[model samples]
Target: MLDPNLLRNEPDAVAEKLARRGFKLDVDKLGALEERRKVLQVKTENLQAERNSRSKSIGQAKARGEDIEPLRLEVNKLGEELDAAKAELDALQAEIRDIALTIPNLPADEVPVGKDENDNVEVSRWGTPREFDFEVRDHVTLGEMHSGLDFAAAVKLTGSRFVVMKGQIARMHRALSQFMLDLHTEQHGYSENYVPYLVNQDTLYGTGQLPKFAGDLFHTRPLEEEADTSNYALIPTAEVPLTNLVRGEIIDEDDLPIKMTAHTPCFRSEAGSYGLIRMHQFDKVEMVQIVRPEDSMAALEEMTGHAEKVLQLLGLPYRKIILCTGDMGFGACKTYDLEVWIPAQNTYREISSCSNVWDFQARRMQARCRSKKKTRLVHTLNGSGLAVGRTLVAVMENYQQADGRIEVPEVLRPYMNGLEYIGE
Candidate 1:
């Protein structure tokens, strides 16, 4: 959520900023609502004052041994009017709040103004895509050569867009997540966390996933019909749980940066797309940073570099791109995507996204920091250190041998029990 004061006082200015991302703000409707709110508030105040004075007169009349029924009746009428006015005022405020909740965050001034992904600006590239002497096989074809990935079994058990990995491929996938978690926690200065895979609606709302993107999420019905709490939804990303750790919290200024990481299975109900690139279920190692507002922009770059480090260490070719206004996620003011090169596809594909929400989510979560008795909302950032499945795909496609073997990246050797290759 944006600052209510900003939305209320500067709707036109807010609307103009929103237009960069192609959102049409209804300024006239907002203006009329503001007008009604002002009038109703004054009327409610007047009724309260009238009731207080009339009640005082009733007390005086009773003390003077005179009939007080008329004064009491007048106070009762004013009380009823005040109640009605207050109810209307509350309803109007709720309507305004609903609109505010749906509004996306304003893009950072530095973000390029553009319509979509094609307009995103490339920041840098690392590691050239290797020229293969043999025909490069896609991960699916490579996985099939060794019985590594079984989409057919997944389909038999459940449905499409799911995969069952066996033998060395499964171990390599596990190794990828373990390597990422260790790197982030031990080297990148992030505290490792274990969080619930299922979360309530408010938890999702804290991260800007609910009230708009509900259709894109997978929800679970309560086991007991009499359960009082809201039904839980499978987390779409570890970002939802990891970033929400500081929700409704106020930290001391000295502890301004709260860095955390987690490896979790993410579920989404959106229409399935590519192989492991888009799935109903996937695993990812996620990073989140909660910092002072002044440090957020720099933090975004630093976070992006952290993600790039994963690709660098894996010896995978990837490029970093800054998302244009329309390409950024709803809660982000600015975002950078790391796209790993796929040998078969002959192009870069996104494997990680880092963003600076810049108090947008903090405002929604009421997450704040205090200095010298003053409090203000903190800024938030989240990124995939790397999506585990896509990293697995990259490794298979990039490291494929002419003889149908898969050479494991050196860093993953220890986790794979000293095995240097699969399908040997």
Candidate 2:
């Protein structure tokens, strides 16, 4: 949610910024609602004041042994008017709130103004994409060579868009997640957290996922015998639960920058047919930061580097790109995507996205911080340390030997029991 004061006072300016993201704010509708709210609010307050005055007059008249019935009737009339005005005001506010939730965050001034991904600007590149003497094979082909990736079993068990890994491949996948968690918690100053895999609707909304991307989620219903008035959904990412930790909270200013990391299983309904790149269920290590508003942009840059650190340690070639307006996420004021080199595709693919949502998400969560005497919304940011499965894919393709063996990256060897190669 945007600052209501800003939206009310500068609808035109707000709409112009939103236009960069290709969103046309309905200024006319919002203005009408604001006008109605103002009118009803004033009417309600006036009626309440009149009602109180009439009631006091009735009390004094009765004390003087005079007829108080007339004043009493006037008081009741004013009360009814006040109730009607209050009801109208409440309804108007709800309408505004609903519209507010649908609006995407205004892009930061520095964000590139473009229509889509084609316009994204690359900030930097790290490491070189390794050149192969032999023709490179895609991860699917390479994984099948070792009989470690099993799509057949996954399809039989859960339809399409899934995979079941075995032996060293499974171990590598698990190691990727562990490595990321360890890197973030130990190297970065992030507190490790374990959060619920299933969350309610409010949690989704607080993270700016619900009421917009609901179809992208996997929701759950309790058994009939154990039913409750709740609908739970599997998290699309750990971001939902980790960022919501400060939901509806007002912390002391001393705790301004709260950093946390978690390794979790994420489920999504929109699993495309793109190997491990898009899957129904995947493991990821997510990092979230809650900070004072002034520090959010710097935090975004620092967090992006944290993700890049994983790629750097693993010797993976990757590039960092600043997302253009249209390419930015729904609640991201600014975002940077780290795209790891994929030898098979001869191009880079996104392995992590770090975004500073500013106060948009905090407003939704009612998460705030109290300064000396005033309170303000805190900024929220989240990113993947590296998508575990994708990192595994990168390793398989980039490290494949000419003879069809996968060399474990030096950083992951310790986790893999000092073993250097898969399918050795």
Candidate 3:
């Protein structure tokens, strides 16, 4: 949520900022609501004060041996009017809050202004795409050549946008996840966390996923006995849980930077994506950091580097791009996507995305830090250290030999029991 003061005091300025992202704020409606809110609030307060004074006069009248029924009747009328005003005020405030909740975070000053993904600016490129001697095959073709990726089995068991890995492919997938988690936890100063895959509505809302992106999530039906109260959904990303760990907390300023990493299976309900590139279920190693507000932008670069480190170690060619204002996620002021070179597609695809949420989520979750006598919202950042499935896809496509075998990247050889290749 945006600071209420900002919205209330500067609706025109807020609307101008929101326009850059193509959001039209109903400034007139908000202004009208605010005006009515002021009236109702003052009316409620005055009625309460009048009721108290009149009630007191009734006691005085009784002590003076005069009739107090008239004063009592006036007080009763004031009480009823006060109740009505209070209810209206509460409803109006709720209406305003709903509007505020739907509003996306304002783009940071440095974020490029553009309409969509096409407008995103490339920041840097790393490692050249390898030259191939043989006709390059896509990950799907390579996986099928080795009988390692079983899409048919996955469809029979569940549905499309799913895959079942067999033999070395499955092991490699596990190895990628392990490698990422270890790199983040041990070398990147993040604490490894195991969090629930299913979370409640409030948990999702805290991470800015609920109420707006509900259609993009997989929800669970409640049991008959617990019907109305229990609403749970499979996590869309580990960011939902890892970032929410500090929800409703106020930590000491000394613990300024809280870094956490988790390897988990993420579930999404979106369709129209093929292969491991986009899946209903995918494994990812996610890194989340909470830091003092002033340090968030620097932390974003540092966190993006941590993700880049994984691709560097694996010798995967990739590039980093900064998303434009209109292309950034709902809660992020700025975002950087690392796209790894896919040999088969002859292009780069997103393997990781790092973002600085900059107190947008902290405000929603009430996650704060105290500095001396004052407290303020802490900034949040989350990135895929690398999506394990996509990294595996990158590895298979990039390391495939002319003979159709997939050579293990050196860094992953230890986790693969010193094996040099798959489908040998």
Candidate 4:
């Protein structure tokens, strides 16, 4: 959520920045609603005061042994009017809040202004796409060579947009997730966390996934038919749980930067168009940092390097790009996307996204920190250490052999029981 005061005080400036992200702010409509809210609030308060004053007068009349029936009728009338006014005022406030929640975060000045991904600027490239000796194969074709990728079976068991991996491929998939978790937890100084796969609505809202992007999420039926706290959704990414750990919390300044990481299965209702690149469920290692506002920008750069480090260790080539304003995620004010080279596609595809949400998410989560007796919203940042499934795809396609075997990357050999090659 944005600062309501900012919207109220500088709607024009706010609208101009939001325009860079392709969002139009109806300043006139919002202004009109705010004005109505103020009027209704005053009217409601006045009615309450009149009703309270009249009731006290009635009590005084009764105490004096004087007729109080007329006063009673006047107070009752005032009470009815006050109740109606309060109801309208409450409805207006809810309307305003809903609008506020739907607005995207303001893009940072450093973010390149563009309409979409094509306009994103590449920051740096590492390594080179490997040359193939024979006819190159995509990850799917390589998996099929060894009966490791089984989309047909997944469809029979569940539905499309799902895959069932078998044999060493399945093991390799697990190895990828474990490797990322270990890398982030040990060398990166992030606390490894185990969190629930299903979360409440408020948790999603805290990460800017609800109200507007609900269509992209998978929701579960209420846990129990009789419970109000029953509604839950399958987590879209570990970012949801890792970042939300600070929801509604206040940390001491000593704990200014809370770095956390987790590996979990992420479910997406709208995974877009691709093979495993888009899946109903996939594994990912997520990194989140809650920092004092002063340190957030530096934290974003540092966290992004950690993501890039994973690709470097795996010996896969990738390019880092700064997402344009329109391409940044809903909660992120600025973002850097790591696009790994896909040999078959002959282009880089996004395998990780690191973003600085500034205080946007913290404000929504009510996450705060105290500095010299003054409280301020903490800044939140998150990124995919690497999307495990796509990293698996990257490894398979990038490291394929002339005879259709996959030479396991040196780092992953330890996790794969020292097996150097996979496939028949």
Candidate 5:
């Protein structure tokens, strides 16, 4: 949420940033509502004072053995008027709050101002794309060559946008997730966490997954009956679970930076999405942090680097792109997208996104730190260590042999039980 005070004080400045992202802030309507609020608050307070003064007069009249009926009637009238005025003020305040929540954060000065991803500037590329001497096959084709990775089987089992794995391929998938979880927990100084696959509305909102981006999510509820706390939705990413751990919390300063990591199945409706990159359900290793605002930028760079480490270890070539205003996620004030080089696509496609959601989520979660007796929202940051399913695709496609075999990258040899190659 935009600071109410900032919106109140610098409406034009906020509106200008919003315009850069193609969102318009109705400053005029908000100004009018705030004006009404100011007027109603004073009137309500005056009426309350009059009612209290009249009550005191009634006490004196009764003490003097005089009837207090007139005073009672006047106080009753004032009470009714005050109630209506207070209601109006509350309504106006609510309008301002509703507007405030939709306003995106102002882009940091360092963020490049552009219309969209097409305007995004690439920083540099990592390891060079391997040269293809023979006809190259994408992961899907290579998977089909192997007996197990059956998309048709997934269709019969579930619906479209699903796949079934078996044999070494399936083992590789499991190893990918386990390897990531272990690396992050044992090496990266992250607190390994296990969380529920389904969460409530409040948790979703706390993680910036609700009030926006709802259509992209998958939800579940009791079919037969309704219970007050029964509503839940499948998690879109482990980031949802990992980041929300501190929701509605007041952590000590020592716990200000809560670095957490989780490996979980991420289910997305993929409602309107295409094969933009294989959509639907996938596995992800997500890392999240609730850091003090002062250290958040550094934390963002570190987190993004942590993600890059996965690509580096896997021997997959990749590059990083700083997302423009139009391309940044709803929760991100500034984002750095890591795109692994895809030789077939002849372009780098984003596989991991690390964002600095500077207090955007902490405000919603009521997660704060009392610094020197002044409480403030802690900054939230999250990134995918790598998407398990896509990384597998990257591995298979990028490391494909001329004979349709898959070579295991050197770093993963230990995890693969010293196995050197996958396909043949």
Candidate 6:
């Protein structure tokens, strides 16, 4: 949600910013609702005040043995007026909240102007694509090299965009997540968290995914499953849960930066996309941080380093690309996409994305510093510690040899139980 101040005071500016993300803010409708809101608010307060005054007079008049009937009629009239005004006020506020949730975050000045990813700006590249002496295979081909990677059976079991890895591959996936969670928690200063995969409507609204992007969500359908509530959304990423920890919270200044990381299975309906890069459901290691305004940008760069460190240790070649205003997510003020070299595709495909959502999600979460009424909205940042599935693909394709064996990166050797390679 945008600051109500902006919505009320600068509807024009708000509409302009939202247009960058192609969201049309209903300015006229909001203006009318706000107008009604002011009228009802003043009427409700005045009537409530009059009602209180009359109630006091009725008691005093009865004690003085004077006629209290007039006071009684005044009180009744005021009570009715107050009730009507309060109801009107409540509806107006709800209407405003509805419109506010649909507005996307305003992009920073540096974000380029373009319509989509094609307009995104590349920042820099890391290592070059690994030169292969033999024909390269993508993750699917290499994944099936082991007994556990059962794509055929998985397809039958869950349809497309789902995989069932039983042996080393599954463990590899687990190890990547474990490694990321540990790296962020122990070394990168992020608080390790385990959160519920199921989230309510408010949580999604707080994270900027509710009103506008409900189509992409995997919502709990009506009456198909057992639950108290008729609706809950399967979180698309741990980012939704990790950042939502601060939902409606006012943090003490001492806890200026609340950094958290989590490993979770993300189930996205992915209703809009179909490709290797886009899947209906996926697993991810999501890292999030809420920081004081002064520390946010520094934290953003520091956090990006932590993500880059994973590729460094794994000896995988990758590059970081800065996304333009138009290409960034609705909640992101600024974004960085890390693309890893894909040998088969002959390109550097996106492996992870880190974003500095400066106060965007915070404004919605009402997450802020304690005693800091003046505290500008805290900045929130999140990134894939490295998308687990894609990282596996990088390893499978880049590390595969002519003999079909996969050499484990030296840093991952311990996690692989000291095994040097797979598919000997």
**At residue 239, what lDDT does model 1 achieve?**
92
Q: In candidate 5, what are the lDDT values of residues 144-262, reduced to their tens digit? A: 78764888888899989888888878877887887787878888888888899998888888877777767888888655566666678999998787778888888877777888999
Number of residue pairs clashing in candidate 1, backbone atoms closer than 3 angstroms, sequence gap of 3 or more or interchain: 0
What C-alpha lDDT do the candidate models reach, one value each? 0.91, 0.92, 0.93, 0.92, 0.84, 0.81
Residues 42-114, model 6: lDDT tens digits: 8888888889888998989999999999889889988888888888888888878776777777877777777
lDDT of 3 by residue, 67-151 (tens): 8888888989999999999999999999887878898998898999999999999999999999998899999999999899999
Q: Which residue ranges in model 1 land beyond 4 Å of their true spot? A: 272-274
- Per-prediction tally of clashes: 0, 0, 0, 0, 2, 0
RMSD of 2: 1.9
C-alpha RMSD by candidate, in order: 1.3, 1.9, 1.3, 1.6, 1.8, 2.9
TM-scores of all models? 0.98, 0.95, 0.98, 0.96, 0.95, 0.90
Clashing residue pairs in candidate 5, if any? 405-423, 406-423
Candidate 5 CA-lDDT value: 0.84
Give the C-alpha miss distance for residue 40 in model 5, angstroms.
2.1
**Tens digits of per-residue lDDT for model 1, 1-424:** 8888888888889999899988898889877888899999999999988888888888899999999888887988898999999999999998887877898999999999999999999988999999999999999998988998999999999998789999999999999999999998989999999999999988999999979899889888877764878599999999999888899999897997899999999998865343677789999999999999999998998888889989999999999899999898999899999999999999999999999998888988999999958899999999999899999999999999999999999999999999989997
Clashes of 4: 0
- Model 4 over residues 57-100: C-alpha lDDT tens digits? 99899999999999989998998898898899899999999999
Residue 302, candidate 6: Cα error in Å is: 1.3
